[PDB]
Amino acid sequence: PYRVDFILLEHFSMASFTVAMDVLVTANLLRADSFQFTPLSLDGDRVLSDLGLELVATELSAAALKELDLLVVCGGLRTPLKYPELDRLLNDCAAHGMALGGLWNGAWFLGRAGVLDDYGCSIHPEQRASLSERSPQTRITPASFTLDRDRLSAASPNGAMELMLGLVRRLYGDGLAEGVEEILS
Amino acid sequence: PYRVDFILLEHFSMASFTVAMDVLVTANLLRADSFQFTPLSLDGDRVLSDLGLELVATELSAAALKELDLLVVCGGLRTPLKYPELDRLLNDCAAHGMALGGLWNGAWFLGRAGPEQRSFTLDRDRLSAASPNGAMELMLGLVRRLYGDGLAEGVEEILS
């Protein structure tokens, strides 16, 4: 069971998050227990999305990240660029051997944390300039998603759907991913 | 501001419900105070979506259904075909002319009045949709009607 958790930041792109989840759930629909996932919050059991809706989430536990294969930072247009704690948290997750990710502008955070050094990534245009300024060793891919080793990132909802399809393809084959796509699309 | 409220039933289609909300929030981005909305629950302040995620909602209230210009029934595949209160309450809302709608198979509950056979359709003041994509056009038509093709076309360019 590939374990992936999503850190939902305030004003996170709901469409980015829900489409990525759809892919992982639909994958399970055709192939049992392929993925285990959990929405996570840095502070609280509720996170507000860019749609005004709040989602219930588990309060992140530095310890309970240990059993993870992938930690994804979910941001959005109005997502505040703070959360200084994410820097050592992601660095340690990177040291531990975890794959790391970001939707919409989550790559900005992976960038500041120094975990995209000599890696490609996708990020929303609004934060492209800052990401390059803070992380010179990070390359900006001229496309909506990026699958570079253990660094997965997307700049848009569609990029996020392709990103998780890329993940499904890399783990269980073109067969499952192609099947997942048929249902969703 | 036009008022639309969504009743989220257990296992409701998240994708279906979210894209609908996207159209409205987006319209508000292009034209302030265009819409107002609230997710509603028959029991508890939390509802399990079809994706395993739970959204915080507001428990349904009759006295509240006074400033509502539209009410929608959001359902999903594994959603149970029950909820008795959906007869008195729906008919009561129709008893006020109030607009009513349904997403995915939330039209079935509409059938207790007027593959769950029983993508979208806008019939006078009774809206419907049987797919996430149908939910999009559904709310786009709502905008096209209450505000025109201009604002409606603008929203369509953003979501995609």
Ligand SMILES: [Mg+2]
């Ligand atoms: Mg720092």
